[PDB]
Design a protein around this nucleic acid. Sequence first.
DNA 1: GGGGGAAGGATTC
DNA 2: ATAGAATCCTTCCCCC
Length: 341
Amino acid sequence: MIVLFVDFDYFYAQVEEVLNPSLKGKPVVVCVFSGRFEDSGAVATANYEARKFGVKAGIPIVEAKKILPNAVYLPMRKEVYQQVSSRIMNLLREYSEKIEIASIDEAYLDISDKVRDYREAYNLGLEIKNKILEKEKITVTVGISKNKVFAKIAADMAKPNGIKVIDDEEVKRLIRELDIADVPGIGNITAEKLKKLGINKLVDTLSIEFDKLKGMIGEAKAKYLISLARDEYNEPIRTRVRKSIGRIVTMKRNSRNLEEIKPYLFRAIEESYYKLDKRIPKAIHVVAVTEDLDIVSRGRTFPHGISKETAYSESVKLLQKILEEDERKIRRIGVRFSKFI
DNA sequence: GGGGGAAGGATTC
DNA sequence: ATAGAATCCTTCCCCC
Ligand SMILES: Cc1cn([C@H]2C[C@H](O)[C@@H](COP(=O)(O)NP(=O)(O)OP(=O)(O)O)O2)c(=O)[nH]c1=O
Ligand SMILES: [Mg+2]
Ligand SMILES: [Mg+2]
């Protein structure tokens, strides 16, 4: 099985460039402004000029601007990149029927039934990198390997505007000399919970008793790492179905007062129902971010769909329940709708 | 034992 | 004390 992974390079910023080509060559930063105080927010992405100096996803804008004040700082037009992204994915749907669209900027492709070795898979990578560049003028990065995980690591090395093929002997090489935190799906809390037991690369998973490994990271992550270490990881390219729809907004002040929070929560419900797009949900979760930035949630399921007016009603009850059973102050309030019909 | 709902956890982009 | 969104897994809990 040969998986072709694609992921666009600094996606949000690049769109800003192809839409205003002068931004080229400068360090660019796409920001999410919350409104609390002007320049409160996070950095969605930054181009590799700006990324060179430490501007990365997830940093506060206030910490970005101290490092590059004369860099361009644009607000996010996700609305735009989404339409740009949808056009690119229709381009990939012509190179295989079996395609997983992993996110706004990512796709996996089952090319087992369209090429038969890696040389032609590599060439089909170039085939795709160019038809993107001509149609829509975007550079992307291509990973190639035997399953979704290793085509993802392939692409992470090749960024930016790069193409990479991971053959079966370097697969065996990487299991041996890939530092474990770089495996997709383990971040820093799990990353050193494996350093704390000496695991730095995938190989060492086989050389550790299973029960001690399971007892700490859980069963699913254990089989995940072990099967990856045995060259026995197989999960298929599946059409992704949205399971969750939601919106969450930052309030201008922290508050525990039910009726000042209400308009935001109401605004979040209206916007969430627009995005629902004729899919009727059965579950609603009122989710709040606290002052210390913990995430509290309360949910409810129904034997029937939820209507907008029913959603309004129960949301307040779930929001009520939140502050009854937790007494911090809320900063961002929002809703999530699950269990569609 | 385990399916199923609810809440927290961790990761992703 | 900095966005916004989506997903899978774990743990306790009800129930058969
Ligand atoms: C990681 C991350 C990404 N994003 C958005 C903007 C990114 O451009 C896009 C994710 O694509 P990516 O592969 O995570 N990062 P990138 O495409 O900007 O840059 P590159 O792939 O590392 O070259 O979605 C966020 O809004 N918050 C994030 O924390
Ligand atoms: Mg990308
Ligand atoms: Mg990505």
